[PDB]
Design a protein around this ligand. Structure first.
Ligand SMILES: Oc1ccc(C(=C(Cl)Cl)c2ccc(O)cc2)cc1
Ligand SMILES: Oc1ccc(C(=C(Cl)Cl)c2ccc(O)cc2)cc1
Lengths: 221, 230
């Protein structure tokens, strides 16, 4: 596990380098059972990239296959959502699901509360001046903190140590950016508190998906 | 004045404001059925709710918010608040959930509840494993309240949240932790809050598929005009 020996810069470079691409919504001019189909199809494609992203998250492959599957199983929607919020950040009042799918709230059945929360997190990130380097650290934290409470025991400890490294990385990014010590802790806290909003958003999102109606996962890991 | 508090004054304010520990109704009718246990828990929850509202009003910055925002924060946080309290109480009772000194329950006593209990016990164990301190607990609880549903007081709320962060840090420094340990523990603590949110959503899921008089209580007790509510 060279992962516990990574420096702040190495962790960032690894994470930046592992970023999935921004995918496009399926193009077909003729055509919300259709609108949800657009989002589900984007989601499925995004999932493939996410799983291979997860394998490049330092310390992730050191885990057993059982736990890798479980972490991804708990965090996938949270991860999809934070990506979405990151993409929408420079489009106030709009959610950028894809470059060719930029929806306002007016265009958002039980998705309305979801969108408003997503939009609010987007603006929150906007006024915090969230940086790409910080964003990838956060995304990684979601992956690892997803189902750690729930699930070798040593396995839990490895996760915890890597989380500590990501915390150090975040702090280092802020110090370099010239934040004072006090400012560093406050912003660390602000970022992490937004993670609970993300979890909330995911839970509500995961119980609307059930108002409708694994293999591929173990396959790739 | 709220935003003018030192760390030390902030922590003693929160400690002074702590609600009491309540006892479950003494209808000990055991063994429990689903109806009887939920009946008992709900009655406990309802009585705690009263004390929670009083507590909230003493959290620095809370009464600064509009009535609508006070109600919203409590609506969003109340179950998270009850659950963190339970986790704190159960901390020195491994394998058990101390809902009340007279209502100790283990996993083999909880039934969609089982999953929720398992989550509560895991968190409780996590608290123990990182040696969570009373001063830290009260900070986290206030953060849960102010972060549950956080347009001029979105900024006022964030100012108070910052002061609470400064207080948690200050407590860790006083304790003698290095700066690196401070940052790391702060992170570990706040990351737990995402799990508490999760357990709360799952709990609210179990409840609503089956209660507490939240809206009316807030109306009675958040009424600045009422002197002896509810
Ligand atoms: O990049 C994203 C793609 C879809 C979504 C969905 C939301 Cl906000 Cl509900 C979504 C995910 C899975 C689905 O089957 C439908 C929508 C979120 C982010
Ligand atoms: O101090 C507590 C009391 C009850 C509970 C409940 C759980 Cl764990 Cl589900 C609870 C809350 C509201 C209810 O109507 C029933 C149970 C949690 C903490």
């Amino acid at each position: 596990s060279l992962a516990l020996s990574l420096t702040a810069d190495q962790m960032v470079s690894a994470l930046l380098d592992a970023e999935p691409p921004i995918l496009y919504s399926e193009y077909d001019p003729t055509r919300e059972a259709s609108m949800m189909g657009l989002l589900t199809n984007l989601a499925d494609r995004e999932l493939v990239h996410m799983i291979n992203w997860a394998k490049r998250v330092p310390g992730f492959v050191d885990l057993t296959l059982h736990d890798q599957v479980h972490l991804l199983e708990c965090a996938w929607l949270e991860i999809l959502m934070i990506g979405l919020v990151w993409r929408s950040m420079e489009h106030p009042g709009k959610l950028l699901f894809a470059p060719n799918l930029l929806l306002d709230r007016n265009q958002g059945e039980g998705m309305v509360e979801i969108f408003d929360m997503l939009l609010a997190t987007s603006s929150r990130f906007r006024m915090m001046n969230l940086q790409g380097e910080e964003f990838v650290c956060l995304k990684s934290i979601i992956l690892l903190n997803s189902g750690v409470y729930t699930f070798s025991l040593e396995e839990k400890d490895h996760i915890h140590r890597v989380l500590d490294k990501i915390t150090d990385t975040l702090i280092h990014l802020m110090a370099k950016a010239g934040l004072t010590l006090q400012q560093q802790h406050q912003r660390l806290a602000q970022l992490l508190l937004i993670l609970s909003h993300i979890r909330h958003m995911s839970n509500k999102g995961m119980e609307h998906l059930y108002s409708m109606k694994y293999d591929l996962l173990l396959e790739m890991l």
